[PDB]
Design a protein around this ligand. Sequence first.
Ligand code: ADP
Ligand code: SF4
Ligand code: SF4
Ligand code: MG
Ligand code: MG
Ligand code: MG
Ligand code: MG
Ligand code: MG
Ligand code: MG
Ligand code: MG
Ligand code: MG
Ligand code: MG
Ligand code: MG
Ligand code: MG
Ligand code: MG
Ligand code: MG
Ligand code: MG
Ligand code: MG
Ligand code: MG
Ligand code: MG
Ligand code: MG
Ligand code: MG
Ligand code: MG
Ligand code: MG
Ligand code: MG
Ligand code: MG
Ligand code: MG
Ligand code: MG
Ligand code: MG
Ligand code: MG
Ligand code: MG
Ligand code: MG
Ligand code: MG
Ligand code: MG
Ligand code: MG
Ligand code: MG
Ligand code: MG
Ligand code: MG
Ligand code: MG
Ligand code: MG
Lengths: 582, 184, 96, 258
Amino acid sequence: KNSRIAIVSADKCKPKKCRQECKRSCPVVKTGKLCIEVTPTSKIAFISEILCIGCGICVKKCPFDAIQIINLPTNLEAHVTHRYSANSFKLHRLPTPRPGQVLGLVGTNGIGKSTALKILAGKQKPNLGRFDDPPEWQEIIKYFRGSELQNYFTKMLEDDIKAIIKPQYVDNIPRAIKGPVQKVGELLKLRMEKSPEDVKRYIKILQLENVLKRDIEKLSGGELQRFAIGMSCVQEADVYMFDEPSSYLDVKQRLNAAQIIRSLLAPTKYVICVEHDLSVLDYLSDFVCIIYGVPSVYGVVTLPASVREGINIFLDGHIPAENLRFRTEALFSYPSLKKTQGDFVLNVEEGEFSDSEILVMMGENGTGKTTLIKLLAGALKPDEGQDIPKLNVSMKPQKIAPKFPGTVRQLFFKKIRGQFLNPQFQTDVVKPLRIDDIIDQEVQHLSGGELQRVAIVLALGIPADIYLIDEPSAYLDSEQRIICSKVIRRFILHNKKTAFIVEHDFIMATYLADKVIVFEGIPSKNAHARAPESLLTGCNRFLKNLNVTFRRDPNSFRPRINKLDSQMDKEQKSSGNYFFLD
Amino acid sequence: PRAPRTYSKTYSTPKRPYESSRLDAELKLAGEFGLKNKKEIYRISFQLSKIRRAARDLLTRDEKDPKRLFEGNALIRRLVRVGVLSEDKKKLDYVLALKVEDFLERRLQTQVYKLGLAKSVHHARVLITQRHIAVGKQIVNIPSFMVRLDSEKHIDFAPTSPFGGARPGRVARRNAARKAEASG
Amino acid sequence: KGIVLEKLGIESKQPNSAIRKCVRVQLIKNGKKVTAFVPNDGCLNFVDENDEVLLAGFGRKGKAKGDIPGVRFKVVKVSGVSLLALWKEKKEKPRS
Amino acid sequence: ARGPKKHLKRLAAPHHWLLDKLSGCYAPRPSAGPHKLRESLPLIVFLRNRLKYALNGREVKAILMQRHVKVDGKVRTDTTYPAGFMDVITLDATNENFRLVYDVKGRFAVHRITDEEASYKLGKVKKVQLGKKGVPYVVTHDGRTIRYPDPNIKVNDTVKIDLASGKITDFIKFDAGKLVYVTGGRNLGRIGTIVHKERHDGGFDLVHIKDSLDNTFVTRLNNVFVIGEQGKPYISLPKGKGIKLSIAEERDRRRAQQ
RNA sequence: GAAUUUGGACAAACUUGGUCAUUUAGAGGAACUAAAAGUCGUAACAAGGUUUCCGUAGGUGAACCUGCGGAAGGAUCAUU
RNA sequence: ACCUUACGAGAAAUCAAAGUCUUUGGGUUCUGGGGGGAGUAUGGUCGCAAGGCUGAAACUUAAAGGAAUUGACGGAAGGG
RNA sequence: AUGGUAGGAUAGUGGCCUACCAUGGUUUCAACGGGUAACGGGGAAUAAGGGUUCGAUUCCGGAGAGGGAGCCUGAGAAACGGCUACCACAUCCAAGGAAGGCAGCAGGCGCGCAAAUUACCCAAUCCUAAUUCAGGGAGGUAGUGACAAUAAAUAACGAUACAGGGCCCAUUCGGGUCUUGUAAUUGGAAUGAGUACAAUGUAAAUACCUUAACGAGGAACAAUUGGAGGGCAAGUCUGGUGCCAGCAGCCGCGGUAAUUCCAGCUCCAAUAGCGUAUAUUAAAGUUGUUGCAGUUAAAAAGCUCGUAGUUGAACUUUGGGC
RNA sequence: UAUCUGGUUGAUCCUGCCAGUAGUCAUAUGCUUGUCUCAAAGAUUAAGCCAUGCAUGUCUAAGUAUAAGCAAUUUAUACAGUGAAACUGCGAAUGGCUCAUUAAAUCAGUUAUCGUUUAUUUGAUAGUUCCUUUACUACAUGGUAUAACUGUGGUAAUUCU
Ligand SMILES: Nc1ncnc2c1ncn2[C@@H]1O[C@H](COP(=O)(O)OP(=O)(O)O)[C@@H](O)[C@H]1O
Ligand code: SF4
Ligand code: SF4
Ligand SMILES: [Mg+2]
Ligand SMILES: [Mg+2]
Ligand SMILES: [Mg+2]
Ligand SMILES: [Mg+2]
Ligand SMILES: [Mg+2]
Ligand SMILES: [Mg+2]
Ligand SMILES: [Mg+2]
Ligand SMILES: [Mg+2]
Ligand SMILES: [Mg+2]
Ligand SMILES: [Mg+2]
Ligand SMILES: [Mg+2]
Ligand SMILES: [Mg+2]
Ligand SMILES: [Mg+2]
Ligand SMILES: [Mg+2]
Ligand SMILES: [Mg+2]
Ligand SMILES: [Mg+2]
Ligand SMILES: [Mg+2]
Ligand SMILES: [Mg+2]
Ligand SMILES: [Mg+2]
Ligand SMILES: [Mg+2]
Ligand SMILES: [Mg+2]
Ligand SMILES: [Mg+2]
Ligand SMILES: [Mg+2]
Ligand SMILES: [Mg+2]
Ligand SMILES: [Mg+2]
Ligand SMILES: [Mg+2]
Ligand SMILES: [Mg+2]
Ligand SMILES: [Mg+2]
Ligand SMILES: [Mg+2]
Ligand SMILES: [Mg+2]
Ligand SMILES: [Mg+2]
Ligand SMILES: [Mg+2]
Ligand SMILES: [Mg+2]
Ligand SMILES: [Mg+2]
Ligand SMILES: [Mg+2]
Ligand SMILES: [Mg+2]
Ligand SMILES: [Mg+2]
């Protein structure tokens, strides 16, 4: 019931010799329309995507197998698992949990990946598309007859399964505590639910050593995520969910974050997670499950694949198992020179912060990146003066916090309407981004992922002296990262301003880097900043400081991590060249 | 795979669909015997056709022939046992002269009516179907039962029923519940 | 199954004065062109364009049926919905 | 193809086992043994379907592994061991002794025999030749090889086999006036005296045979088993004594006792 | 006793042809059927206004016409 | 070859065979299976040629046909 | 290619192969070629008798594992849930290399007019192994399933009002017993469909069988599918359209009075089933052995000779007696 | 269950076909669908292509055990109970699936091996070997390995090693 379209391959279509039998055959061409435009001199036949009914007559009538029918995503009104409400988002399939193994969910944000995990956990019992009269468990199980999920859901009713989710919203969890106020450790202590010595010591692995003693509220997003993982890992549960674990983590932590999740695995246990970063997923998942569909309208879960084949399908955008194309193919002086609290000395070191030419500013987790950006905004002063007040900042907090009953389009009036010129100005930048959808919705119950996108547009608005985008990588999908990086890029040529981007990712950083403030230093103990080093030099230093090497994929230029002891990785340390495409 | 289950079809529709004589004949049969469709009459005419074909195959054989003696005596015995064939007419030529009313008098519906426990063929049908009838000590709720003429003495009401006693029934117990409710 | 090419107004043979309301359809398995007669009163208002129709013979074992010159097939379903269900308003069509 | 078959579907099993066509896709394929798999009876179908001492093949295996049943004096804890014609089967619990003889309907009978009779069996000699170092031997119908036999024993005779030793007690020759058992063919189960045998050089010697009610018949020499002289047989015959009443006389006899 | 190696039979395949059994395009023809209130005549049905038909040959806007031999299915069962 | 019967036959005209054929078997060879398309295409084969002999299909159609009857008409013959 | 003699190879026989030799072998009684929408058989459907059509598919035999070819191991394989190469697809890759074979069971794509669950289990049937014990998508169990097949609910019974025979009467149009059916007339009884303790069922369940408790009666627990000119059951209707729209397998209907369309009413046929398309069988003595036809309807070759084929007079031991 | 009927004409009798009529372990499709038993089911087109998981393994008193495995003893300082791995032995050639090929081929019934291979099963069956045969020796019992294991490693990756 999927829409079917005929695609023509550039290989093995040869119009000069073919006698254009595809064109004569077509019924839509007979009714008058130019469904297939092809002449003997032409390079390739063209088939209109929207003027093809997908009958398949052309495929049979070609001398060559140049034509092929593929499917397209569509609303199906069948095999529905869940509707939230009337004229609301529809979840068609349900991923099947695999024992012993990691099962990754990949898709655009807003497609129902988070909806799947709640359903599997038992948090959100499915209604099979009946919001008005939700069926009870007896009816859900009989829907699931003939499947492994029937036996899996029967066990949950009998309390044979314990299932824990690791929430995708870091921001929500500090608000709700066991008590009025507590430090990090006593939360862990009561719910250790595991002997510390006998099992592998996650706290040493999850780099929580210093932060056992801080109160939970002071922690940044970067630290907090590794705490969230720690609460799930300490639990003894049959099934383990991890929602967006990559967020607010640097490259070394992400590899360790991959390491911790797999260590949970046992023959009885189940581990299923939704991770957006492609590169970590190589070391995270045995199997990859693609979800697809128009965002916030419908979502369809597909058959699993092995990671190597699974990731390559996602980058390709054409699942071969189900013959559909789901169409996502990825492709001045300011010498502050100190700031302390007495405990974490972020001694700054002199910089010529350049003119009108975008700069990354990249650190590690405890290395206190925010302190510099807090200091460029005047706040968190040095003790012994030498504080320059010159710069005017359009910053955007890492912990974005909603305080107002605002519809988006009115928030467009309130601060960012400005002059709103049509060419090359805020109208132009919005068009790639899907912000035209979200204007109706309330910001308070705008989604966390979308709330990041609104903040990114919100901050770019006021030119001031210098907008400083802080950490724009979180809560975005793969595709949305590619769009966002270019949309920042196109804008920031037009203004003669600069920006210090505070990424914990690497690939967006490399795309959005002209000069690199490096942050060598022990994390979560006294650091030392350095100068805004040039691109090839600046990645390599940080790459030296972690013993991580990146390889340039031949076909698609995708940056993939090397194994820790391997021929290429050994070669690039000896050559000194930790990175490419400089 | 396992051995296939044998099945066979038990009736046959007539050749000309719309012929007024045969229609009026089968409606007279259905009204007099209390039947619900023409499939029952087609079932009996099929069974009678099979009996007549076996008897036709034996009468071509000469007398004193061992197959004719064996299977003629067996077929005559089965017909006199179920009561379709009278005790005097036992000569395999009377077998050919049988007709469907001879079979239709032996169903449990018309036997329950003839024994007088019913007052109608339609009352007999619903008495059978609603399990107030027992041909031995065993309930039968099939109207086409073809009683075997020593079972005719034993058709009576079921012991686990009203009309054979020891508990009245749903609507009687409800009405008694209402009258005991009004008394208290 | 086939794809509707156009709608025809074939006039009946003598003596019969009518317009018979058939369609041209290109078969999906062969690519062959075929005329099919849309049976009932008003049922040509379902069979509009580029549709998946299902076709059967008329019963005359390959012969043209009536006063209708030269059609050998009738329409059974259009867009997955049967034509009598559309005609008796038991069901109704999808958009396309 | 490609090698020997190990399964045996039901509806392909021999009809005289009387295995019902439902309750399973397979039948117990007889393992290689002293008898051909068509003219044999596995111990599973004898213990379960004929004697009803078990309800499952699992129970037949449970009976067999405690060494209860023994066939021709040897223990044989095998589920599909082919027990054939004239084999003795000893069940020491219940102290029972069976011999596999045919009833006249052509099926294997539950023929209970006494303890003196279980000490022997008859065998029809299939070939007499000279083995190595010039030692003669006979081969009986269940494949027993017996060395240094009597020189008068030629083929199609019956030798009485001792079953504690493998020795030969005595033997019945082949001529007219001899009591025979028909094991094979249409007339399987009938007992009659031989009147004369037809030479037929080149294949399939026939023999004419008449029972006690003077009904003659004829059989190939492959299916005939001499069991003694007229009057006494050398074994105990089952009920019916191989008479082959017709179906007319059979329902008359059934309406006597009913 | 491993790599390697000589001859052989078995032989998948490959390259250059050449046949046949299969499709497409195709200037043009060339018919046939159905439906068609068209154009010109009136060949057949009456001795249909030159009896009709057959075979063969030639001719002609079209039916058709004409020569030669035949048939009655003719318009003659018939002239001791 | 003819005349007369109709034993008989046949749809009838008519037939001494076109009879002895549902009461169905003397021997044997050839041909037909609704009307067109069509004795046409195509391939063989014979012929100097003209042509002969073999010989379809797609498609199309509800009749085409036989013998008699009663009318109507005839540039057919008689009568009133 | 057909045979002869020697050898070779084989488990063995043999042009199976080689060397030498001879010129054979098949065919109108249809060889050889072509086609098969051709695996063969038991068998299936439909037939008075004779037949005709089908058989991929529960059993038996064969063959194959994407296409070909080659081989190891072993008693047994030219094995594909074994290996080797080529051809065709196709995956991963760090570009060095590596791994493939669902015409097994589920499942997916594609194709189409067309066909089910990525469930439970070895409890039964049996098979394998060192073996009673382990294993088995073989096999069983439930799911889906109007493919066919069996049985068989959708109501039964009164009391009173309405349309009927001789007679008790021999009391003219008065009760009407003895019935037959209609009722904007009322009554209780009866029961499953369904729901559900329980037990049984089962490897564990589900369901069946049994059974407390509940569960009926007219807007409730409401049977359809095709038809009503003829063939061929069923309109002496009423509105609508007006050679249009449409119906009609065939003949035909429709231009103001439509027995045929579109509807209402009524009625008929089969009925948990009924209609349509395609194919096939009977009807078909329209394939004709039984058993057709050939003057004119289709059809006796222009005429004779003639080989194969088919068909060919009569005759030989009978009668008698126990 | 040995049956026909409508349509060529102004009417008739025929030839003759078309149409109806009944069935189908023949498919499909439409409309409709309460109950019990029973049951086929990706053959037809594409022997087209396959994501994922499973479908072939196996232990007895009775081949090999020092697991640095688990147990409890009390026979037993050589072992002796239970039992992973691994070696050895068997099995994986059966079953299941499908119907492409194939027209004297397969197949069916009927023969033959006096023309041959045969694990297994079952029954029989082996005083002869001190190879130079007075010792040249072990026959109250002869030689090597090698796995699992232990330890050191390579590769992005494999049931690699
Ligand atoms: N709790 C909810 N109630 C209603 N609608 C929701 C809810 N959660 C999500 N949605 C809508 O449906 C979609 C579900 O996807 P979501 O749960 O966000 O997973 P993902 O992270 O893959 O988008 C969202 O895009 C959102 O628009
Ligand atoms: S397959 Fe397409 S490109 Fe090739 S000849 Fe045909 S129409 Fe032209
Ligand atoms: S699939 Fe059909 S409509 Fe689309 S291009 Fe091909 S012939 Fe045209
Ligand atoms: Mg989410
Ligand atoms: Mg007409
Ligand atoms: Mg066996
Ligand atoms: Mg003329
Ligand atoms: Mg004229
Ligand atoms: Mg003229
Ligand atoms: Mg004339
Ligand atoms: Mg005429
Ligand atoms: Mg030789
Ligand atoms: Mg030779
Ligand atoms: Mg084939
Ligand atoms: Mg096929
Ligand atoms: Mg088979
Ligand atoms: Mg094979
Ligand atoms: Mg394949
Ligand atoms: Mg192979
Ligand atoms: Mg396989
Ligand atoms: Mg499969
Ligand atoms: Mg109706
Ligand atoms: Mg109608
Ligand atoms: Mg009407
Ligand atoms: Mg009528
Ligand atoms: Mg009508
Ligand atoms: Mg007939
Ligand atoms: Mg015909
Ligand atoms: Mg005829
Ligand atoms: Mg003529
Ligand atoms: Mg003629
Ligand atoms: Mg002539
Ligand atoms: Mg001729
Ligand atoms: Mg001759
Ligand atoms: Mg002859
Ligand atoms: Mg005419
Ligand atoms: Mg007329
Ligand atoms: Mg017909
Ligand atoms: Mg096999
Ligand atoms: Mg032995």
